[PDB]
Amino acid sequence: APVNALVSHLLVVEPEKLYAMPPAVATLCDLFDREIVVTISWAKSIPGFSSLSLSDQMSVLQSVWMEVLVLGVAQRSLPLQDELAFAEDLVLDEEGARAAGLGELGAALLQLVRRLQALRLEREEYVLLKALALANSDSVHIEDAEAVEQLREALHEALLEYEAGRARRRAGRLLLTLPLLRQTAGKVLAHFYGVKLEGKVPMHKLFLEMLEAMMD
C-alpha cells in the first residue's frame, strides 16, 4: 500500500472510461468537446489548482487542455500496437487516421505512444505526468506565476517521492517526454483549427472557444 497523498488523490479523481458512442472527424470533434468538460472538472479537483485565481485557472486550462487530452489518448493506446484509442469504442491505426481525415496526426500521436510505451508507464506515473503537464503551462497570461510554480513543484516532489519507493533516474525519463507531448498537442490543435476554418464539420461552442484560446 503506497503512501503519497497527491498520487492517491490524483488516482481518485481520474475520469471514468470514455466511449465515442454507444462521420469520422465529426465524432472526434464531439468527443473532444466532451473531453474538455471532463478536463475542467478534473483540474478543479486538483489540490492547488482551485486556489489559483479564477483568471489564472482559465489561462492555465486554455493553454494546456490539448496536452491533457492528447496524453489521455496516448495512455489509452499503450496496450495497443500501431493503434490509437481515441475512445474505448473508437480505435484507429495510421492508415485509419488517414481516411478519417486526420491527416498526419495519426503518425504524430503514435510517436508519443511509442515514447511512453518504451518507458512502461505505470498508472501513478501517468496521473502525475498529466497533472505536471497542466502545472507546467507557459502561458503568458498567467498572472500569479509563483503560485503555478508552487503547484508544479508539489507535483514534481510527489513524483520523486513516488519513484523513490516504486518503479538517468526514472523521474527524468518521464519528464523528457513532455516536449513531445506539447509538440504533439500543437499539431492536433493546428489540424482542428483547420477543420474549423474549412467550415464543413459541426463543432460545439466550447471546443471552438478552446481551439481559439490555445491558439491565442
Binding site: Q62, K205, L206, E209, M210, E212, A213
Partner: peptide
C-alpha cells in the same frame, strides 16, 4: 479571447 463556455463550467459548482 472569448472564454464564456470555459467560465461557465469552471464556475458551476457541480
Amino acid at each position: 479571447r472569448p472564454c464564456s463556455e470555459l467560465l461557465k463550467y469552471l464556475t458551476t459548482n457541480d
